[PDB]
Design a protein around this ligand. Structure first.
Ligand code: GPX
Ligand code: IMP
Ligand code: HDA
Ligand code: MG
Length: 431
């Protein structure tokens, strides 16, 4: 297909950055359509690492125009910190990254709000990345937030910023009894980059339309993951945006009928960062093994990721929610050496019933127990394997069983972090 969507099928960190970097070799455009700098991805080429947050995972290819669509909540500081890091590395960010004037702005006070509230929640805290993503989407939806296009008129922006900061500070001081955020500083800081921000503005919805008509390849990149979706996730232990496939059209401006192939990034085991339901979570040695072997640490906060087996019941919600066309199985190599691997095939409900559908809100996951299928592991090293022939029979069975359980094929297999430690059985663009 011309327009390919690549998102997380679990709880984020499935390996989207690497895959987007890899597949963008044929694309003209790459588009982030939701989230903000809460996302954190580690790309690796010839051993060289690059960690992205707000910048799309195709920023390393000059033949590709990276774009942050209207759905993304944009942090000027974050953007500036990333542009500079890459520029000092030979990536002329400014000339390949375009952005939507509609993107909501994440300013200092949103971080204060994020923190104040998270502390207010006490024990029931969400475990957010402290990037102020929540408060940004809140201001947006309330129709009081600031967007990129507001910088078009510096004078009126400053006024809008004064009264809004006024609004939020009353809450920070009086209600939360927290430090107020200084207006003059946020204004200065922002104005310091106003011209850089505006220079990258393009009418992305119309752009994508023109691109579509010409038949150009577009790769849409999702942040976080399906079970973190604001509507369809383990509410309230979710993020504030639609991490699923529908977020593509809302936060880009492209029409829904123009999604040709949706690829879901599936990690061979499961992880979750932040509080919330995690049926197949492991707390034993295998949990430590996984975290250790798959170096599971938040690329944004550095927090240790909760690990567990792969949940095919949960993956099957992702399948239907995103109308997946295919999967990209990642970190197969991390399972190398386990005596046995397990797949969650159903849920034992607290009342006794066995089901193969996931509950919706976090509370309804309360007594849910995982029912697994146990399969034999493999001692051979798959790391670096770029062809199935190098994959052991157990590994091939695991892969095959997942396809059987989900009904969706594994078109791409990833056996290592580096860009080329991958197996492409079916390329989404010509598939
Ligand atoms: N062994 C192995 N490692 C892989 C693979 N894919 C990604 N990583 C490793 O997993 C991490 C991917 O970044 P993320 O935050 O986890 O994912 P996302 O883009 O969805 O947020 C990175 O950390 P990293 O070690 O430097 O190399 C990468 C893979 O197939 N095998
Ligand atoms: O990009 C991400 N990767 C993985 N987990 C994330 C990511 N962004 C948010 N989360 C989790 O989503 C929840 C809400 O975070 P927020 O998006 O910072 O408001 C917390 O559990 C986060 O840890
Ligand atoms: O890469 C993103 N992380 O896993 C989120 C975090 O560090 O909190
Ligand atoms: Mg990540």
């Amino acid at each position: 297909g011309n327009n390919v969507v690549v998102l997380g099928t679990q709880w984020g960190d499935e390996g989207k950055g690497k895959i987007v970097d890899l597949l963008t070799e044929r694309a003209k455009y790459v588009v982030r359509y939701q989230g903000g700098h809460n996302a954190g991805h580690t790309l690796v080429i010839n051993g060289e690492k690059t960690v992205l947050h707000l910048i799309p995972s195709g920023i390393l290819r000059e033949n590709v125009t990276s774009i942050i669509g209207n759905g993304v909540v944009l942090s000027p500081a974050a953007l500036m910190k990333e542009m500079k890091e890459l520029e000092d590395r030979g990536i002329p960010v400014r000339e390949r990254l375009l952005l939507s004037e509609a993107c909501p702005l994440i300013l200092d006070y949103h971080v204060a709000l994020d923190n104040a509230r998270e502390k207010a929640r006490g024990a029931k805290a969400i475990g957010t990345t402290g990037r102020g993503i929540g408060p940004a989407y809140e201001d947006k939806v309330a129709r009081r937030g600031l967007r990129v296009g507001d910088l078009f008129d510096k004078e009126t922006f400053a006024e809008k910023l004064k009264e809004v900061m006024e609004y939020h500070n009353f809450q920070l001081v009086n209600y939360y009894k927290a430090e107020a955020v200084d207006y003059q500083k946020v204004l200065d800081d922002t104005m310091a980059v106003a011209d850089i921000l505006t220079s990258m503005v393009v009418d992305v919805s119309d752009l994508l339309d023109q691109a579509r008509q010409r038949g150009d390849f577009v790769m849409f990149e999702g942040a976080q993951g399906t079970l973190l979706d604001i509507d369809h996730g383990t509410y309230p232990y979710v993020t504030s945006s639609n991490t699923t496939a529908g977020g593509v059209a809302t936060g880009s401006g492209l029409g829904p009928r123009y999604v040709d192939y949706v690829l879901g990034i599936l990690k061979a085991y499961s992880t979750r960062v932040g509080a919330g339901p995690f049926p197949t979570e492991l707390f034993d040695e295998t949990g430590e093994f996984l975290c250790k072997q798959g170096n599971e640490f938040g690329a944004t906060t550095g927090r240790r990721r909760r690990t567990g087996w792969l949940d095919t019941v949960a993956v099957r919600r992702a399948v239907q929610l995103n109308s997946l066309s295919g999967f990209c199985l990642t970190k197969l190599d991390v399972l190398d050496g386990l005596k046995e691997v397990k797949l969650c095939v159903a849920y034992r409900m607290p009342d006794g019933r066995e089901v193969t559908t996931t509950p919706l809100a976090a509370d309804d996951w309360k007594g849910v127990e995982p029912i697994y299928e146990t399969m034999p592991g493999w001692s051979e090293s798959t790391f670096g394997v770029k062809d199935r022939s190098g994959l052991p029979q157990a590994a091939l069975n695991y892969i095959k069983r997942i396809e059987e359980l989900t009904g969706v094929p594994i078109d791409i297999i990833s056996t290592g972090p580096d860009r080329t430690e991958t197996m492409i059985l079916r390329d989404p663009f010509d598939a």
